[PDB]
Amino acid sequence: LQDYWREEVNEKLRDTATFLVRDASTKMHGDYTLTGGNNKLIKIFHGFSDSSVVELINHYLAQYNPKLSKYQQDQGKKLHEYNTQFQEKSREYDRLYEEYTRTSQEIQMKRTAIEAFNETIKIFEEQCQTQERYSKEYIEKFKREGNEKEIQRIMHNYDKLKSRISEIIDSRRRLEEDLKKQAAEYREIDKRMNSIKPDLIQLRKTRDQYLMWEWL
Amino acid sequence: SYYHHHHHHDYDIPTTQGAMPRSSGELWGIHLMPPRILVECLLPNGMIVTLECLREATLITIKHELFKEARKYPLHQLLQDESSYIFVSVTQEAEREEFFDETRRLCDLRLFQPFLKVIEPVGNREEKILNREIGFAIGMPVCEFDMVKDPEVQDFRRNILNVCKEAVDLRDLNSPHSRAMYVYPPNVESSPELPKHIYNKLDKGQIIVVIWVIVSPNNDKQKYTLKINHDCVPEQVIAEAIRKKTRSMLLSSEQLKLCVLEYQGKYILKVCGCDEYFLEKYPLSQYKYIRSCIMLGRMPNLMLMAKESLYSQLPMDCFTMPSYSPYMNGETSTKSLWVINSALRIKILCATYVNVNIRDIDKIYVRTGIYHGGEPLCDNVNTQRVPCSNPRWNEWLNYDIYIPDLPRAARLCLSICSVCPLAWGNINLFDYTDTLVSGKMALNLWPVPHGLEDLLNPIGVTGSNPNKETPCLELEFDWFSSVVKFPDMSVIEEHANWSVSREAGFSYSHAGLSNRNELRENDKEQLKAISTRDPLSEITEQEKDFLWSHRHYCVTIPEILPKLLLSVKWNSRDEVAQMYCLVKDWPPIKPEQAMELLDCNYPDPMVRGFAVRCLEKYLTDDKLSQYLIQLVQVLKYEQYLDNLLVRFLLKKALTNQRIGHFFFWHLKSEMHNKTVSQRFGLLLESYCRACGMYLKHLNRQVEAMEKLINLTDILKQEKKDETQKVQMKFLVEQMRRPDFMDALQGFLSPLNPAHQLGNLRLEECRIMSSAKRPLWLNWENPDIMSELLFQNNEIIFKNGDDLRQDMLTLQIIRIMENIWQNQGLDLRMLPYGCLSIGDCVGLIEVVRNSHTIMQIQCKGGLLQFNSHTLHQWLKDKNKGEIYDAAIDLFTRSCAGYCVATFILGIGDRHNSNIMVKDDGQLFHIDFGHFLDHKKKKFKRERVPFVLTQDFLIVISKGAQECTKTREFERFQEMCYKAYLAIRQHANLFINLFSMMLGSGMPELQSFDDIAYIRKTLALDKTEQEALEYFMKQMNDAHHGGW
Ligand SMILES: O=C(NO)c1ccccc1
Ligand SMILES: O=C(NO)c1ccccc1
């Protein structure tokens, strides 16, 4: 009834939520095979067809089981122009997936980097305090005992400590706003992939029109 | 005129990297710390003294130099004696790290910011705070687990020590013998008998060995060339060796035998030049080194080592348990699942965000569906709402399955879609404690894979993405005024028997036969027909009902079970309950089938527990280490952390250090991958805590790879766009540094821990020509008898490429080579050693005296390259009686690769893919994409090994019209026998590929990728038709011959 079409029948049934008829794997096994009840295999053997084969297919599925080909003239080189469009569009999809991935690693590198900063910071805050225990236990004297041979230099340590602390919190800050442009850049990369995806699928399908009906 | 004068305005080349991965270095932001560097040092006093010190300086060195310069700064007296102090700083993994092993150098600390801090050893159990060892070996801090909330993790960590403790006791049962079994397990083939073609090399089964010895002055060695039976065990070989030492005119025959007996058991056999050891009752030729020696035309070089001087080496492992150190509640605190009366409903609410254009997409929706791997009801999409801009729902999806039907391994799967999928996640409907999930959940979603166009993705990882900055998806699970539990095994068996007895007395009529002691004899053959079918041969629903009906008969053909289990309806509580009971006392089967039942088609705990029991009885430690890759991948498919298969493997890895080794690397290689990160970390943690001293050997390997990862990174990022010559100056300058000299010398090859890697012969180390700057490394073999095996071990470290496809084809190649060999057919493949140890990072065993066909042709360069150059080049190595062999070898190796590359469908074979050893063996390297990933652009497949003129000559000796020779007819017959041999073991390969769907390889994303291997072996056709398929397809590709 050619006037009706396993691996490639699974492939064409992909992206469908439907039925079609197929030849067997052995001649001696059975005749043909039919493929909404969750897509599964219905052997055409069910001495051939009880209704001459096609009369049973039009007829239909709970009636026996408990758990129950467009020609495409719709709209040579029309492969070459659409397939290079598909591949140059595919090239773009996988262009972004690389950028999508690398950015995601990069981002996660930045937040772990920040956790490092924050802890590093805390060890320097904790330090500037550690002297005020042991330094103003020995600010007891203040003005005498060889004047300020001790007390001038103690300040210099304190002075650097705090200005270093600042440079750390400046570097973290810079990182935090670096992560933001990235987070935004990441969301935007995801965005265009989602706009492409269905167009990329249609080009693969609209290729599949003239795919069956040198260059590539 | 060329381009009809058309300008491309978009186009510009200032920075376009198609012309001419991507683990931070020794400090944050910089790969290689400057040779002098400035380190702020914080003390108990608040002074931050900024020392310069050397990149490579120890913490001791900086300590005693911060001891002296602290005298020059204020407030000295209150700073204690330095011996009462330790360093600590924040690392790049962002953790405060006390630095105990102060032999460690500044570069080797992974320091983030160049600063130290002094404190005292808080927590005087300092021996314990060498978890650092483990966290370094694992590649994440152990304390990162302690802070995990989820009690499944905390339970796993504590519960899995059962297996640790047990395995360590089993090591020390017959010690110190059994500790040397653990450490040096004997390396022996699976079949004790040899194949015929190996036997024939021996004259009625006798090998010439050579035992060696050493005695005072101790720098002298002594050959003792025996001629004993291949099948005599090492004891006897030690005996005959001692007979010759002593045999004398002054010993009688009787005195001799007494002097034998005493001297026998005090010695054991070791392979010269590497740390293999013959430690049990095994026929000499069952050991792999011997059967290897036979084949190559070599004379075994063993050694008589004293058991004293072996048991000298093996250290006391002494495992210690960490800080993580029938109902007494009257029956039914909880409600059994089978009591509940309702359909399943689940509340979708809100997706915190989705990244989509408001223009380009029309509308979006949460799609859902309940699963067992494949689906038990219609997918329940939710209505469209706030499409592409602030999307929340608040609906209750109603799933047509009544709650007591839900199978144990049942899972919600979900995604968000467009008028194509946006982001996905799955959830186990049952928690690890058997408890049916209730309340609200916060399911962060995973980005869709690349090629995956399917909306829902139920083969993806179950659980929420541990990156909180993703599409969150809040949802509620119906609550039945009580905590619900999966029914106890008692309860299920009861209900089985009821449905069994309720079967017996049903109507004369039942929709005909439908899904139900008639022992039909045509039917009794239709089972065996279906039994033997290949796993991927999809079954018809008629055949399911057929199989399902004679289920009780199927137990006599135990091998049918995979086909039976698929046919069972899992959304029928009744059907499943009987199946569970069959499986309870079903009889065990071959590990090659049991493996099938640990793929994604089989999620059920009962089914999978059976499979573990088949393996527990019938899988040998040889066949385990053969299929170790697939078993590690299959851990992913498990629902929960603690389970039968992890316990099995962890035990076997702790039994056997050669398993343990690759089991550690295989987990470690995928440690970067956040979907397995936790599961595998926790497993890696348990292994490191139990494995004993090997942890310290693994740390040397791990610490080595880091240096090499870091070196190549610098080479690939800065020293790119500089001539090889400057890069080679840089390479060697870097390797001579003392931190490298420490780190890259004196450790075990991870390609084979048997081999030791001594000192780095830098004269031979070099950066290869490839763009990815692979390092050719070369080490002295520090073995005492290195002379007899190899003076120099050289292996390739490659930072660019994803090795794990190669890894798998090399695996499959071996398994072909072994199937052939044992079946009689001798086709010598060379499955060189390759090991993925990280995200596109690994090791590759070199093969000395082998060159690409292209290189051969440049040695025979004089306009046009002659096809005879190969044949001439091969004759120039092999002359005389030799020559006929070198052809045989080439012919045998060519046939093997012809069949294997055809079947697997690996990347097209040109001259720089294919290599020839001086001895005449041909082998393929760099396989690329296995199952034809290069048909996503662009029936009847391809022959990827196309036998040029060049090859045909060599097969047929120096010849004209070379397709008509008998040499070529014999070559053809090898290919026919080989192609059929593999086909008769096709299940194994179908399963082995299926088990690897869990690894994120773009070539194995679903069962329809593994389609190819069915078509190429042509299993749907008969064998004679497949023969003629192969001949057809081999004729097509060479334009005649076949
Ligand atoms: O689950 C059941 N409960 O009655 C059931 C379903 C179908 C057929 C027989 C029984
Ligand atoms: O370099 C080559 N190796 O096969 C080559 C490439 C193209 C054509 C002929 C030879």
Q: Hunting for tokens 């959304």 — which residue is that?
A: B571
Please tell me whether residues A15 and A97 are part of one structural domain.
no
Helix pair angle (B644-655, B161-171), 10° resolution: 30
Considering only alpha carbons, which residue of chain A is nearest residue B21?
A102
Considering only alpha carbons, which residue of chain A is nearest residue B1014?
A7
DSSP conformation letters of B4-59: TT---SS---TT----------SBTTBSS--SEEEEEEE-TTS-EEEEEEETT-BH
> Using a CB-CB distance cutoff of 8 angstroms, which residues of chain A are in contact with residue B379?
17
Query: Quick one: which of B375, B376, B403, B381 has its CA closest to B393?
Result: B381
**Listed residues A75, A97, A119: the one ending a domain:** A75
Please tell me whether residues A18 and A108 are part of one structural domain.
no
Nearest by CB to A119, which of B90, B420, B540? Answer: B90
DSSP B446: B
- Residue B304 pairs in a beta bridge with B269
Write out residues 760-779 of B within 8 Å (CB-CB) of A: none
Please tell me whether residues A35 and A81 are part of one structural domain.
no
Name the strands in the sheet holding B439-442, side by side, starting at the edge strand that comes first in the sequence. Answer: B392-402, B343-350, B474-477, B439-442
The answer to whether the beta carbons of residues B382 and B368 sit under 8 Å apart is yes
Considering only alpha carbons, which residue of chain A is nearest residue B455?
A15
DSSP conformation letters of B731-785: HHHHHHSHHHHHHTSSEE-SS-TTSEE-SB-TTT-EE-SSTT--EEEEEE---TT
Q: Is B574 in the pocket of ligand 1 (CB under 6 A)?
A: yes
Distances (CA, A) of B934 to B156, B812, B931, B942: 43, 20, 9, 11
Considering only alpha carbons, which residue of chain A is nearest residue B22?
A102
Opening angle at CA A198, ends A194 and A202, nearest 5:
160
A197 contact partners, CB below 8 Å, separation of at least 6: A93, B418, B420
Question: Quick one: which ligand is closest to B516's CA?
Answer: 1
B420 touches chain A (CB under 8 A): yes
CA B915 to chain A, closest CA, distance in angstroms equals: 31
- Encoded tokens for B912: 């720089």
Q: Is B1023 in the pocket of ligand 1 (CB under 6 A)?
A: no
In B429-473, the DSSP E strands lie at 439-442
Write the CATH number for A182.
1.10.287.1490
Amino acid residing at B548: W
Give the C-alpha separation, A14 to A17, whole Å.
9
Please tell me whether residues A71 and A134 are part of one structural domain.
no
B456 touches chain A (CB under 8 A): no
Which residue minimizes the CA distance to atom 9 of ligand 1? B574
The answer to whether the beta carbons of residues B480 and B335 sit under 8 Å apart is yes
Please tell me whether residues A24 and A87 are part of one structural domain.
no
Please tell me whether residues A188 and A132 are part of one structural domain.
yes
CA B1009 to chain A, closest CA, distance in angstroms equals: 9
Task: Report the run of H or E that residue B564 belongs to, with start and end.
Answer: helix B561-567
**Listed residues A21, A54, A75: the one ending a domain:** A75
- Phi, psi angle pair for B235, to nearest 5°: -50, -60
- Encoded tokens for B568: 């069972």
Looking only at the bridges linking them, the beta strands covering B48-54 and A21-23 are unpaired
> Ligand 2 centre and the CA of B854: distance in Å?
8
Query: Quick one: which of B1011, B987, B831 has its CA closest to B933?
Result: B1011
Task: Encode burial over B5-19: b for 16+ CB neighbours within 10 A, e otherwise.
Answer: eeeeeeeeeeeeeee
The answer to whether the beta carbons of residues B141 and B276 sit under 8 Å apart is no
> Ligand 2 centre and the CA of B912: distance in Å?
8
**Listed residues A75, A100, A117: the one ending a domain:** A75
Looking only at the bridges linking them, the beta strands covering B343-350 and B474-477 are antiparallel
CB contact under 8 A, A194 and B420: yes
Please tell me whether residues A101 and A201 are part of one structural domain.
yes
Q: How many residues does chain B have?
A: 1042
CA A1 to chain B, closest CA, distance in angstroms equals: 22
DSSP conformation letters of B867-896: THHHHHHHHHH--THHHHHHHHHHHHHHHH
CB contact under 8 A, A87 and B422: no
Give the C-alpha separation, A35 to A21, whole Å.
7
> Using a CB-CB distance cutoff of 8 angstroms, which residues of chain A are in contact with residue B937?
87, 216
DSSP B515: T
Write out residues 105-164 of B within 8 Å (CB-CB) of A: 112-113, 115, 117
Query: Quick one: which of B172, B471, B509 has its CA closest to B317?
Result: B172
Question: Quick one: which ligand is closest to B401's CA?
Answer: 1
- Residue B368 pairs in a beta bridge with B380, B414
Which residue minimizes the CA distance to atom 2 of ligand 2? B911
The backbone region for B290, taken as left when phi is positive above 0, alpha when psi lies in -120 to 50, beta otherwise, is alpha
Please tell me whether residues A167 and A136 are part of one structural domain.
yes
Considering only alpha carbons, which residue of chain B is nearest residue A185?
B355
Inter-chain contacts counted by CB atoms under 8 A, chains A and B: 150
The answer to whether the beta carbons of residues B1042 and B972 sit under 8 Å apart is yes
CA B933 to chain A, closest CA, distance in angstroms equals: 15
Task: Encode burial over A167-201: b for 16+ CB neighbours within 10 A, e otherwise.
Answer: ebeebbeebeeebeebeeebeebbbbbbbbbbebe
Max intra-chain CA distance, chain A: 120
Which residue minimizes the CA distance to atom 10 of ligand 1? B574
Looking only at the bridges linking them, the beta strands covering B474-477 and B439-442 are antiparallel
Ligand 2 site, CB within 6 A: B 854, 910-912
Considering only alpha carbons, which residue of chain A is nearest residue B49?
A157
Max intra-chain CA distance, chain B: 105
- Residue B301 pairs in a beta bridge with B210
CA B1019 to chain A, closest CA, distance in angstroms equals: 9
> Ligand 2 centre and the CA of B853: distance in Å?
10
Q: Is the omega angle on the peptide bond into residue B217 within 30 degrees of 0, that is, cis?
A: yes
What is the atom index within ligand 1 of the atom nearest the CA of A66? 7
Instruction: State which residues form the domain around A128.
Output: 76-216
CB contact under 8 A, A108 and B422: no
Task: Report the run of H or E that residue B951 belongs to, with start and end.
Answer: helix B949-955
Please tell me whether residues A116 and A186 are part of one structural domain.
yes
Give the C-alpha separation, B966 to B983, whole Å.
26
Amino acid residing at B125: R
CB contact under 8 A, A134 and B542: no
B422 touches chain A (CB under 8 A): yes
Give the C-alpha separation, B1040 to B457, whole Å.
46
- Encoded tokens for B615: 């393996």
B450 touches chain A (CB under 8 A): yes
Where chain A is discontinuous (C–N > 2.5 Å), the residues before each break are 3, 5, 17, 35, 46, 50, 60, 68, 75, 213
Amino acid residing at A35: T
Please tell me whether residues A195 and A91 are part of one structural domain.
yes
CB contact under 8 A, B46 and A161: yes
Method in brief: X-ray
Resolution as reported, in Å: 3.4
- Encoded tokens for B447: 């980005």
Please tell me whether residues A41 and A119 are part of one structural domain.
no
- Report the domain count for chain A: 2
HSE-up (13 A, CA, CB side) for residue B242: 23
Please tell me whether residues A186 and A176 are part of one structural domain.
yes
- Encoded tokens for B128: 């314990």
A164 touches chain B (CB under 8 A): yes
The sign one gets for the Cα dihedral B583, B588, B589, B592 is positive
